[PDB]
Write an enzyme that holds these catalytic residues in place. Sequence first.
Site, short mmCIF file in Angstrom:
data_model
loop_
_atom_site.label_atom_id
_atom_site.label_comp_id
_atom_site.label_asym_id
_atom_site.label_seq_id
_atom_site.Cartn_x
_atom_site.Cartn_y
_atom_site.Cartn_z
N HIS A 61 -2.47 -1.43 33.97
CA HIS A 61 -1.15 -1.05 33.98
C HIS A 61 0.12 -1.53 34.71
N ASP A 91 26.77 -18.67 23.37
CA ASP A 91 25.17 -18.30 23.39
C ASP A 91 24.81 -18.72 24.64
N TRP A 126 -3.62 -5.68 40.64
CA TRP A 126 -2.61 -6.71 40.17
C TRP A 126 -2.50 -7.71 41.18
N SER A 156 7.49 -18.53 31.00
CA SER A 156 8.60 -18.01 30.12
C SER A 156 9.94 -17.70 31.05
N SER A 157 9.51 -16.95 32.21
CA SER A 157 10.29 -16.68 33.02
C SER A 157 11.27 -17.75 34.02
N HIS A 240 7.19 -10.29 47.07
CA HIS A 240 8.18 -9.58 47.54
C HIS A 240 9.50 -10.13 46.63
N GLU A 242 9.51 -10.82 43.74
CA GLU A 242 9.15 -10.32 42.56
C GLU A 242 9.78 -8.78 42.56
N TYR A 244 12.39 -7.57 44.20
CA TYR A 244 13.73 -7.59 44.01
C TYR A 244 14.28 -8.12 42.55
N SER A 255 25.50 -0.35 38.39
CA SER A 255 27.24 -0.59 38.66
C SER A 255 28.14 -0.33 37.46
N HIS A 290 4.73 -8.13 55.36
CA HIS A 290 4.65 -6.79 55.34
C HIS A 290 3.89 -5.92 54.50
N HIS A 291 3.27 -7.01 53.36
CA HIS A 291 2.23 -6.50 52.61
C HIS A 291 0.83 -6.88 53.22
N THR A 316 21.43 -2.91 51.22
CA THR A 316 21.10 -2.01 50.18
C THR A 316 21.85 -0.76 50.08
N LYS A 319 25.22 -1.03 48.88
CA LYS A 319 25.27 -0.85 47.42
C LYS A 319 25.10 0.79 47.09
N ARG A 438 -5.51 4.34 47.85
CA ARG A 438 -5.06 4.13 46.55
C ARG A 438 -6.34 3.49 46.03
C1 HEA Z 1 11.92 -1.98 42.64
C2 HEA Z 1 10.75 -2.57 43.47
C3 HEA Z 1 10.73 -2.55 44.99
C4 HEA Z 1 11.98 -2.44 45.81
C5 HEA Z 1 13.43 -2.35 45.56
C6 HEA Z 1 11.23 -2.21 47.12
C7 HEA Z 1 12.11 -2.12 48.36
C8 HEA Z 1 11.38 -1.86 49.60
N1 HEA Z 1 10.12 -1.68 49.82
FE1 HEA Z 1 8.43 -1.91 48.76
N2 HEA Z 1 6.97 -2.07 47.67
C9 HEA Z 1 7.07 -2.14 46.29
C10 HEA Z 1 8.42 -2.17 44.90
C11 HEA Z 1 9.77 -2.29 45.77
N3 HEA Z 1 10.03 -2.06 47.32
C12 HEA Z 1 5.82 -2.24 45.60
C13 HEA Z 1 5.57 -2.63 44.13
C14 HEA Z 1 4.94 -2.27 46.47
C15 HEA Z 1 3.45 -2.45 46.72
C16 HEA Z 1 3.14 -3.56 45.91
C17 HEA Z 1 1.51 -3.21 45.94
O1 HEA Z 1 0.91 -3.53 46.99
O2 HEA Z 1 0.91 -3.29 44.63
C18 HEA Z 1 6.03 -2.03 47.79
C19 HEA Z 1 5.26 -1.95 48.86
C20 HEA Z 1 6.12 -2.31 50.14
C21 HEA Z 1 5.54 -2.34 51.49
C22 HEA Z 1 4.02 -2.64 52.03
C23 HEA Z 1 3.47 -1.26 52.15
C24 HEA Z 1 1.80 -1.49 52.34
O3 HEA Z 1 1.23 -2.36 51.40
O4 HEA Z 1 1.02 -1.00 53.28
C25 HEA Z 1 6.51 -2.28 52.32
C26 HEA Z 1 6.37 -2.33 53.87
O5 HEA Z 1 7.50 -2.73 54.55
C27 HEA Z 1 7.85 -1.83 51.59
C28 HEA Z 1 9.06 -1.68 52.28
C29 HEA Z 1 10.03 -1.62 51.41
C30 HEA Z 1 11.60 -1.66 51.70
C31 HEA Z 1 11.96 -1.78 53.17
C32 HEA Z 1 12.30 -1.93 50.50
C33 HEA Z 1 13.93 -2.06 50.69
O6 HEA Z 1 14.54 -2.80 49.88
C34 HEA Z 1 14.73 -0.58 50.55
C35 HEA Z 1 16.12 -0.36 50.93
C36 HEA Z 1 16.58 0.91 50.26
C37 HEA Z 1 17.09 1.82 51.13
C38 HEA Z 1 16.77 1.92 52.68
C39 HEA Z 1 17.75 3.11 50.33
C40 HEA Z 1 19.14 2.92 50.32
C41 HEA Z 1 19.93 2.89 51.73
C42 HEA Z 1 20.79 3.65 52.11
C43 HEA Z 1 21.27 5.11 51.73
C44 HEA Z 1 21.38 3.23 53.52
C45 HEA Z 1 21.16 3.62 54.96
C46 HEA Z 1 19.44 3.51 55.42
C47 HEA Z 1 19.07 3.56 56.56
C48 HEA Z 1 19.93 3.54 57.70
C49 HEA Z 1 17.57 3.47 56.50
N4 HEA Z 1 7.49 -2.17 50.43
C1 HEA Z 2 7.31 -1.11 36.49
C2 HEA Z 2 6.21 -0.73 36.94
C3 HEA Z 2 5.47 0.49 37.17
C4 HEA Z 2 5.68 1.64 36.05
C5 HEA Z 2 7.09 1.94 35.08
C6 HEA Z 2 4.82 2.41 36.50
C7 HEA Z 2 4.71 3.79 35.62
C8 HEA Z 2 3.61 4.67 36.18
N1 HEA Z 2 2.69 4.59 37.12
FE1 HEA Z 2 2.24 2.96 37.99
N2 HEA Z 2 1.65 1.38 38.95
C9 HEA Z 2 2.61 0.39 39.22
C10 HEA Z 2 3.76 -0.07 38.37
C11 HEA Z 2 4.23 0.64 37.66
N3 HEA Z 2 3.88 2.05 37.19
C12 HEA Z 2 1.79 -0.97 39.85
C13 HEA Z 2 2.38 -2.33 40.42
C14 HEA Z 2 0.51 -0.40 40.32
C15 HEA Z 2 -0.29 -0.78 41.43
C16 HEA Z 2 -1.54 -1.48 40.78
C17 HEA Z 2 -2.71 -1.98 41.83
O1 HEA Z 2 -2.90 -0.77 42.70
O2 HEA Z 2 -3.08 -3.00 41.48
C18 HEA Z 2 0.75 1.30 39.92
C19 HEA Z 2 -0.07 1.96 40.07
C20 HEA Z 2 -0.13 3.50 39.63
C21 HEA Z 2 -0.93 4.30 40.19
C22 HEA Z 2 -2.14 4.38 41.40
C23 HEA Z 2 -3.61 3.93 40.86
C24 HEA Z 2 -4.35 3.79 41.76
O3 HEA Z 2 -4.12 3.27 43.10
O4 HEA Z 2 -5.64 3.82 41.62
C25 HEA Z 2 -0.83 5.54 39.66
C26 HEA Z 2 -1.39 6.85 39.84
O5 HEA Z 2 -0.64 8.02 39.24
C27 HEA Z 2 0.22 5.28 38.83
C28 HEA Z 2 0.84 6.12 37.60
C29 HEA Z 2 1.95 5.82 36.89
C30 HEA Z 2 2.43 6.49 35.92
C31 HEA Z 2 2.05 8.19 35.78
C32 HEA Z 2 3.59 6.14 35.58
C33 HEA Z 2 4.47 6.52 34.34
O6 HEA Z 2 3.73 7.16 33.31
C34 HEA Z 2 5.60 7.45 34.61
C35 HEA Z 2 6.72 7.51 33.68
C36 HEA Z 2 7.36 6.17 33.25
C37 HEA Z 2 7.24 6.02 31.85
C38 HEA Z 2 6.80 6.84 30.64
C39 HEA Z 2 7.82 4.62 31.39
C40 HEA Z 2 8.41 4.47 29.93
C41 HEA Z 2 9.27 3.36 29.76
C42 HEA Z 2 9.19 2.83 28.47
C43 HEA Z 2 8.31 3.42 27.45
C44 HEA Z 2 10.05 1.52 28.03
C45 HEA Z 2 10.91 2.11 27.07
C46 HEA Z 2 11.94 0.85 26.60
C47 HEA Z 2 12.87 0.89 25.91
C48 HEA Z 2 13.57 2.12 25.57
C49 HEA Z 2 13.76 -0.41 25.54
N4 HEA Z 2 0.63 3.79 38.81
C1 LIG Z 3 8.82 -3.88 48.86
N1 LIG Z 3 8.02 -4.47 49.09
CU LIG Z 4 7.55 -6.74 49.59
#
Ligand code: HEA
Ligand code: HEA
Ligand SMILES: [C-]#N
Ligand SMILES: [Cu+2]
Lengths: 514, 80, 259, 46, 79, 227, 57, 93, 41
Positions: A61, A91, A126, A156-157, A240, A242, A244, A255, A290-291, A316, A319, A438
Site C-alpha cells: 500500500h 520542451d 515500507w 527514474s526520479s 524525511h 521524501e 517534503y 498556490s 525524529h523518526h 510552513t 505558506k 500501528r
Molecule cells: C506530506 C507528507 C508529510 C509532511 C508534509 C509531514 C510534515 C510534518 N511531520 Fe510527518 N510524517 C509523514 C508525512 C509527512 N509529515 C509520514 C509518512 C510519516 C511516518 C512515516 C512512517 O513511519 O511510515 C510521518 C511521521 C512524522 C514523525 C515521526 C512520528 C513517529 O514515527 O513517532 C514526526 C515527528 O516529529 C513528524 C512531524 C512532522 C512535522 C512537524 C511536520 C511539519 O512539516 C508540519 C508543519 C505544518 C504545520 C505545523 C501546519 C501549518 C502551520 C500553521 C497554521 C502555523 C502556526 C503553527 C504553529 C505555531 C505550530 N512526522
Molecule cells: C500518498 C500516500 C498514501 C495514501 C494516498 C494513502 C491512502 C490510504 N491509506 Fe495509507 N499509508 C501510507 C501512505 C498513504 N496512504 C503509508 C506510507 C503507510 C504506512 C505503511 C507502513 O506502515 O509501512 C500507510 C498506512 C496505512 C494504514 C495503517 C496500516 C497499519 O498500520 O497496519 C491505514 C489504515 O487504515 C491506511 C489507510 C489508507 C486509506 C484508507 C487510504 C485511502 O483509501 C484514502 C482515500 C484516498 C484515495 C481513494 C486516493 C485516490 C487517488 C487516486 C485514485 C489517484 C487518482 C489520479 C488521478 C486523477 C490522476 N494507510
Molecule cells: C514527517 N516526517
Molecule cells: Cu520526517
Amino acid sequence: MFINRWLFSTNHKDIGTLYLLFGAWAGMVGTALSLLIRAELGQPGTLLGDDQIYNVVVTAHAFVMIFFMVMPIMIGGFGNWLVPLMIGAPDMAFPRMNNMSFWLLPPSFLLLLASSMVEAGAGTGWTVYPPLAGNLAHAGASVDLTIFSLHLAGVSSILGAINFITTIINMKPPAMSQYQTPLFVWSVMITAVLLLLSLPVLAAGITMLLTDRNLNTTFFDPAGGGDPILYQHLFWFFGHPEVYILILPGFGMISHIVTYYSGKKEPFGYMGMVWAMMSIGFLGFIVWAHHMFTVGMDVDTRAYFTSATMIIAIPTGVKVFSWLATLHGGNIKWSPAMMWALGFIFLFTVGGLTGIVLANSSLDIVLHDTYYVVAHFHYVLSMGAVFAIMGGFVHWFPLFSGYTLNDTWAKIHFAIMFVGVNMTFFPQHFLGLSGMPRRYSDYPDAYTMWNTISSMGSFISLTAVMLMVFIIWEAFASKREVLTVDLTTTNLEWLNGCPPPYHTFEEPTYVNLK
Amino acid sequence: KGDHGGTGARTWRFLTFGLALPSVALCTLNSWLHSGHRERPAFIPYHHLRIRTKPFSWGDGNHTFFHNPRVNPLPTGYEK
Amino acid sequence: HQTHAYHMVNPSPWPLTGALSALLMTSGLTMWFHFNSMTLLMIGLTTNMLTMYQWWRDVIRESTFQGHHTPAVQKGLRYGMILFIISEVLFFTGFFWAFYHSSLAPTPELGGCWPPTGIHPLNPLEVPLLNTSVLLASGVSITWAHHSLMEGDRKHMLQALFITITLGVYFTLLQASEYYEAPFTISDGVYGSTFFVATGFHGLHVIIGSTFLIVCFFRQLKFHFTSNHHFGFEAAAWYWHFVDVVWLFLYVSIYWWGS
Amino acid sequence: HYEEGPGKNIPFSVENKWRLLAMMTLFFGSGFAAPFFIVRHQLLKK
Amino acid sequence: KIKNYQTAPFDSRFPNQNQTRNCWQNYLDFHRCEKAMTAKGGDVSVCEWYRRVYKSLCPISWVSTWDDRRAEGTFPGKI
Amino acid sequence: MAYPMQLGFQDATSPIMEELLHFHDHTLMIVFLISSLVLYIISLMLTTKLTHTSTMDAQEVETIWTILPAIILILIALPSLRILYMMDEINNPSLTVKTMGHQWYWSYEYTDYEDLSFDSYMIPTSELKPGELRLLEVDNRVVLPMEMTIRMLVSSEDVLHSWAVPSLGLKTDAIPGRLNQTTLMSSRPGLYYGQCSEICGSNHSFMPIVLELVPLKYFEKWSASML
Amino acid sequence: FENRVAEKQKLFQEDNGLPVHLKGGATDNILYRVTMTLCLGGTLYSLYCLGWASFPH
Amino acid sequence: SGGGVPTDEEQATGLEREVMLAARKGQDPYNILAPKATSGTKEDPNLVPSITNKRIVGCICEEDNSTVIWFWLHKGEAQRCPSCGTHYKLVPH
Amino acid sequence: ITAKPAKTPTSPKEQAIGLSVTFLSFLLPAGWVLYHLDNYK
Ligand code: HEA
Ligand code: HEA
Ligand SMILES: [C-]#N
Ligand SMILES: [Cu+2]
Ligand SMILES: CCCCCC/C=C\CCCCCCCCCC(=O)O[C@H](COC(=O)CCCCCCCCCCCCCCC)COP(=O)(O)OC[C@@H](O)CO
Ligand SMILES: CCCCCC/C=C\CCCCCCCCCC(=O)O[C@H](COC(=O)CCCCCCCCCCCCCCC)COP(=O)(O)OC[C@@H](O)CO
Ligand SMILES: CCCCCCCCCCO[C@@H]1O[C@H](CO)[C@@H](O[C@H]2O[C@H](CO)[C@@H](O)[C@H](O)[C@H]2O)[C@H](O)[C@H]1O
Ligand SMILES: CCCCCCCCCCO[C@@H]1O[C@H](CO)[C@@H](O[C@H]2O[C@H](CO)[C@@H](O)[C@H](O)[C@H]2O)[C@H](O)[C@H]1O
Ligand SMILES: C[C@H](CCC(=O)O)[C@H]1CC[C@H]2[C@@H]3[C@H](O)C[C@@H]4C[C@H](O)CC[C@]4(C)[C@H]3C[C@H](O)[C@]12C
Ligand SMILES: C[C@H](CCC(=O)O)[C@H]1CC[C@H]2[C@@H]3[C@H](O)C[C@@H]4C[C@H](O)CC[C@]4(C)[C@H]3C[C@H](O)[C@]12C
Ligand code: CUA
Ligand SMILES: [Mg+2]
Ligand code: NA
Ligand code: NA
Ligand SMILES: [Zn+2]
C-alpha cells in the site's frame, strides 16, 4: 505512428499524459490495498487469517501510493505538462532521457508485483528495516525484488530531477529571472533538488541491505560488527526529504489554484512563498531522526531533533497564512478545484498540528508506532497530496484534454471524498492516544468502536473513487470542447489553447528587459 | 614551487613529466620493494569473520569471489 | 521552423530499451541470487550495453554531425553532468557514513576495537599509496590533454589522453591484484563489507570513467572535437576528477585512518 | 505529422463512448482488482 | 568492601541509553581480574564487584556466548 | 489498559506519565487555539462579496505571522525540553530487569542476585479465563515491586521489537546487539499492559507485555518461587 | 588519419526523413532490431520466470 | 604546440553554425538575448520580431515585479500590455 | 471557463449505464474474492 508517439516519445506533454495514466492506475492498486487493510481491521478478529499477508498488503500500500501514485502524478504528470509551458520552453532539457524516467516505472511496479507473488511477499513495512527484512527473517526473493523496484524508481526520479533542475535553470526566457517564475515551477525545482540529494542515500542503504542479504556483508548485522540502527539513519535521511518531495508540488499547485479561483493575478507574498519552500527544503535534511526517538537515543540528540523539527512549522505557516491572504478580497469562484484546495488547507493544517505534537520527543515516546502517527500522516501527507492532486486534475483537465468536466458531478465527488477521508482518519487519533499500535492486524477489544468507524469511512472514499472514474468517462463521452479561459495573462500554460499543440513555443515568447 | 603565470599546455606537460610521472615511478619502486608474501597468521575461527548467512551464488557457495587460497581461510580454516 | 536554440530530439527507442535493460538486469540479479541462473542477467547486461552505445552514438550524430548543440544546449548538458556528479557524491556519502558509523563505535563482536580483532589491514604506504600517485598523476595528465585541445594541438592531446587512460588502467589492474592478495574478504564482517563495497563501487566508477576517456580518445582520433567545442571531453574530465577525489577520501578514511 | 486536438493527444480512442467505457473499465478495474487476486494467490499457497 | 549490593549503580562512563559497553566492560574486567588472581595464586573474591555488575546488566545469552567463545579460543576481546 | 471509546491517554501510572498528560493538555490548548483561529479566519475570507484584487503589500503581516508561530513554538518547546531532561535525570534504581524480544514473545531476566528468567507469551483467545482480555494477557507476568525505581534493559535475540507500556509512558526499541536502558516507577499496585511496538513479522500483533506491581515482600517471595 | 567529419555531416543531414537512430543506414536497422528483440524477448522470459517463481516447487 | 584540431569556423554545422555566424553579425535570430525595451509609447512601441502573424509577449511591467503579464501580440496596430499599457508592435516575417 | 455544448451528449440514461458499469467493474471482482475468502483459507 502509435509506437513512435507513445513508446518513443520525446514530447513533454505526451510524457506527462503517460505519467498521469500510470499514476491513476497505481492509485487504484493503492486504494484496493488500503481497503484490504481496513477490511482486516473493520471488526475484531482475523479476516485474512494470515498476518504475513496483512503485513505485505500494508507494505505494498505505502510503496504504491508514494512511488507509483503521488510522485509520478505530481512530478512526472503535472511537472512535465506544466513546467515547460509555464516558462515558455519548447520542451524539457533532455526530452529523450525524460522518456526513460517514464518507462522505468512500469518495470519498477512489475518488480513490486513480483515481490508480492513470490514466496510469502515482503511483509516488512515500507521502511524495510533489518533484521526483519534480512535473509533469515525474510528469506527468498521478495525483499530483493522490493529493493530492485526501489532502485528503478530511484533512477527514474534522479534522472527526472536532473532534467527538471536543468530545464528550470537553463530554459526560461532570457529576461525572466528565477524571481519571475511561477510558484509551481519553484516547487518542482526544490522537489528536484531534494530528490537529487536524498535518493542516492536511500540507494546506498538499500544496496547495503541487498549485500547483507546476498553477499554476506554485515552492515546491519551485529554478528559482523554492523548495526540495524545505521540502516534506519540512511533510510530516514532520505525519508524525511521524501515527505517534503511528496507535498512540495502540491503546495505549488495549491498556490496556483487558490490564486486563480480568488480572481487574483498573483499569490500573496510571492517572495515569502519562495523563501518558505526553500527553507522547508533546507531544514528537511536536518530533522530525520525524529523518526527514531525510541531507538535508544541520547537526550541531547532528542532535544536537538525536537527543536529543529519545530523550526519547520514557521516557514510552513507563512505558506498557510499566505494562502489565506490570497483568498482575502478575492472574487471567490466556488469551482470544484477551489473546493479541493480549501479542503487541502484544512486537512494539511490538522495534520501539520498533530506533527507538532509528535515533534516533542517525550510525547513521541508514547505516540511512536501507534495510530496517532498514521493519523498525522494521512492528514498532512496522504490526503494533503490527494486533495492537491485532485484539485490540480480538476483545474487542468480541460487544458490537457480540451474537454470540460461536469462541475456538479465534480462537486459531488469532492463532498463524498471529504466525508470519507475524515470518517476514516479522524478516529485514528483516539486509537493512537489510547495506545493502539500501528502495523497490527487485530486489536484489543476496547479499540473496536473507532476501528469500525474508520473502516466504514474507507468505503465512503471507495464510492468517491468509483465516481471519479465515471466523471472522467462522462467528460470524454460528452465532448464539451473548451472555448475561453479567464486570467490567461497570469496563467501562461493556458495561452496556447486546449489542448495546446504538440509543439508549443517553437517561436519563444518575447520578454524585454527595460 | 613557482611559474604561476600562464597555466597552459606546456606547463601541464611539464608537470606531467616533471612531477606526476616521477612520483608514480618512485611509488612503483617503493611498492615493488616491499612486495613479497608475508606469513599468514594462525587461523582462528572468529565468529565476526568468514560470515556465511547465505551461500554465495557461485562456486560451492563457500568461496568468496576473489578467494586466494594462500591467505583467505574458509570458515573451517585454510585450504590444503 | 523553430526560432529558439534548443534541441527537439527525434523520437527514440533507447529510453524504452534502457528501461527494459534495467528490468532484465534486476530480475536477472534476482534469478542469479535465488534461482541459480545467469540467463536473464546476461541478456540485461547485453541490452544495457547496446542501449548505451546507440544512445550516445546518436548524441554524437546530433552534435558533431548535425549541429544541434548550440551554446544553450551545451550549457544545459553542463548542468546535467554537474547534477549527475552531485548525485554520485551523495551515493558515496552513504557508504562513508556506514564506514564511520561502524569504525567509530566498534561493537563487542569486533573485540570492541578498530580494526577488528583478526583483521590485518593492507599497508597504506604500499600499493594504496601507489594507487594514490597514479590517480593524482592522471589528474595532471588529463589537464594537459584539456589545454592541448584548447590550444589546437592534436598530437599532444592524444598523447596526454593516452597517458591518462593508461594510468586509469594501471589503477584498475593494481586494485584487482590488491583484491586478490588481500587476506580479508567481503565476508570479514563490517571491515570487509565497508572496504570492498566502497572501494568496489569506486573501482566500478574508475572503469566507467576510463571507458568514457577511451570514447573521447577515439572521437579525438576521428577529429570530432574542435578547439572550442568538446563537451564530451569536459564531462569525462569532470567525472575523472570526481573519481580521483573519491579515491582521496577513501585513502584517507578507510586505508589510512581506518588502519 | 501526428493528430492534434481534443481526443487526439491521448494513447486511447474516445471516438465511441461505449468502447471507451469498456477500455476505462478494463484499465481501472484491472488495477483495483489486482491486490484482491494477489491476496487470493497468497492464501491459496497457504 | 561495599556489600549491600542491590543492583549495578549509575556509572558516569556509560550515561546514555545504550548500555552495551557497560555490560561488555564489566565482563572484560571481571575476567581480566579473574585471570590475574587465579594465575598469581590469589583470590577471585577481589573480582567480585565486576562479577555482580556484569551479571546484573548482561543478557544471559551474551554471557553464555562470550563464555563459549573464551573456551573455544575465539573471544575477540583482550583478557 | 485502554477502555472502550477512549479518546485520550490512559491514566498515568507513573509521575512521568502524569507530567506528559499535563504537557499534552498544554499543547492541545494551543493546538485548539491555532486550529480554531485558522478556521475562523479562512471562513471570514470566504464569506464576502467585497473585493480587493490589486497587489497587496506583504512584509508587515509576514512579521506577525512568523513571530507569533515562533513564540508559540517556544511556549511548547520549553515544557517539552524540561520533561525530556527530567525523564533523563539519574534516579538510582533498586533493581535491574532485562527483557529480550523474540518472534513472538518476550523473555525476562532478573539477575541481580539469582539466575531468574522466563518466557512470556500471549494467552490464546480460546484459552482466556472468563473476564480476561483478548490479545493482552500473558501466561507469565512481569512481577515488579511498586513504588520503586526499576532499571529495565531491553534487547532482542532476533529481529527488532519494541517494549512498550503506555500507562507508564514507556517505549524502548529492542535491538539485537544493543542493550537499551529505560527506568520505570509505578505509584500504584496493579496490572499494566503494553504491546510490541516495532513490526517484527507475522505475530507482531500478538506478543504483549503485562506488568504486575506488588509490594516488595511479595515480589521477593515471587522471585524466589520462580527460580 | 584524415578528418572525414564533413562526409558524416552530409550523411546525417541528408533530407530523407529518417530519425537519427536509423540515419546511418541499414546497419542501424539491424542493430535496432537486435536490441529490441533481445529486450522484448527477455521481458517475456522474465514474465515466464515470474510465473515459475510465483508457485512453490 | 602543433595543430590538427578543427575550429568551429571550420567544422561547426547546422543550427550551431547558424547561431555562430549570426552572432558575428550581431544578429539574434534564435532569441538567445533578452530584447531591450524602448520607451513603449504609441510613438516608440517595443518592436517584436516574428516569423508568423502573432507572438506571445510577457511584460514585466516594473523592474523586479515577480508577476509576468502574458498576451498574444498580433500583426497590425500596436497593442498595449493589459496591466501597464506599454505598447508593443509586431514586426513579422 | 466557457465551452461548447456537448458534441455527443450523454443523456441521464447513458450516464446511469456508464455509472453502473463503472461501479460494477470495481465491485464485482473484489466482491467475488472476498465472498470466497474462506474457500481460500
Ligand atoms: C506530506 C507528507 C508529510 C509532511 C508534509 C509531514 C510534515 C510534518 N511531520 Fe510527518 N510524517 C509523514 C508525512 C509527512 N509529515 C509520514 C509518512 C510519516 C511516518 C512515516 C512512517 O513511519 O511510515 C510521518 C511521521 C512524522 C514523525 C515521526 C512520528 C513517529 O514515527 O513517532 C514526526 C515527528 O516529529 C513528524 C512531524 C512532522 C512535522 C512537524 C511536520 C511539519 O512539516 C508540519 C508543519 C505544518 C504545520 C505545523 C501546519 C501549518 C502551520 C500553521 C497554521 C502555523 C502556526 C503553527 C504553529 C505555531 C505550530 N512526522
Ligand atoms: C500518498 C500516500 C498514501 C495514501 C494516498 C494513502 C491512502 C490510504 N491509506 Fe495509507 N499509508 C501510507 C501512505 C498513504 N496512504 C503509508 C506510507 C503507510 C504506512 C505503511 C507502513 O506502515 O509501512 C500507510 C498506512 C496505512 C494504514 C495503517 C496500516 C497499519 O498500520 O497496519 C491505514 C489504515 O487504515 C491506511 C489507510 C489508507 C486509506 C484508507 C487510504 C485511502 O483509501 C484514502 C482515500 C484516498 C484515495 C481513494 C486516493 C485516490 C487517488 C487516486 C485514485 C489517484 C487518482 C489520479 C488521478 C486523477 C490522476 N494507510
Ligand atoms: C514527517 N516526517
Ligand atoms: Cu520526517
Ligand atoms: C541494481 C541494478 C540497477 C540497475 C538500474 C539501471 C537503470 C538504468 C539503465 C540505464 C540505461 C542508460 C542508457 C543511456 C542513458 C544516457 C542518458 C543521457 O546521456 O542523457 C543526456 C542528459 O543527461 C545528462 O546529460 C546527465 C545525466 C547522464 C545520466 C546517464 C545514465 C545514468 C544511469 C544510472 C545512474 C543512477 C544514479 C546513481 C547514483 C544514485 C542527454 O539527454 P537526451 O534527452 O538523451 O538528449 C538531449 C540531446 O539534446 C542530446 O543531443
Ligand atoms: C553493469 C554496468 C554497465 C556499464 C556501465 C557504463 C559503462 C561505461 C559508460 C561510460 C560512459 C560513456 C559516455 C559516452 C558519451 C559520448 C557522447 C558524448 O560525449 O556526447 C557529447 C555531449 O555530452 C554528453 O551528452 C554527456 C553525457 C554522458 C554522461 C555519462 C556519465 C557516465 C554515466 C555512467 C553510468 C554510471 C552508473 C553508476 C552506478 C553505480 C557530444 O558533444 P561534444 O562532445 O561537445 O561534441 C560536439 C562537437 O563535436 C561539436 O564540435
Ligand atoms: C531474446 C530473448 C531471450 C530469451 C531466452 C530464454 C532462455 C530460455 C532457456 C532458459 O534456460 C533455462 O536456464 C536455466 C538456468 O537456471 C536452466 O536451469 C539449469 O541450469 C542451472 C545452472 O547450473 C541450474 O539451476 C540447474 O542445473 C538447472 O535447473 C534450465 O535448464 C533452462 O530451462
Ligand atoms: C472492498 C471492495 C469490495 C467492496 C464490496 C463488493 C460489494 C459486492 C459486489 C457484489 O459482488 C458479488 O457478490 C455476489 C454475492 O452477492 C457474489 O456471488 C456469490 O454469491 C451468490 C449468492 O450466494 C452466488 O449466486 C454466486 O455464484 C457467488 O459467486 C459474486 O461472486 C460477487 O461478484
Ligand atoms: C529578502 C527576501 C527577498 C526580498 C526581495 O528581494 O524581494 C525576503 C523574502 C522573504 C522574507 C522573509 C519572510 O518574509 C519571513 C520572515 C519575515 C520576518 O518579518 C523577517 C525575517 C523573514 C525571514 C523575512 C526576511 C526577508 O525580508 C525575506 C527573506
Ligand atoms: C596515428 C596518430 C597520428 C594522429 C593523426 O594525426 O592522425 C598518432 C599521433 C598520437 C599517437 C598516439 C600517442 O603518441 C600516444 C600513444 C603512444 C604509444 O607509443 C603508441 C599508441 C599511442 C596511442 C599513439 C598512437 C598513434 O601513433 C597516434 C594516435
Ligand atoms: Cu515483536 Cu512486534
Ligand atoms: Mg518504531
Ligand atoms: Na483483524
Ligand atoms: Na574545455
Ligand atoms: Zn506591462
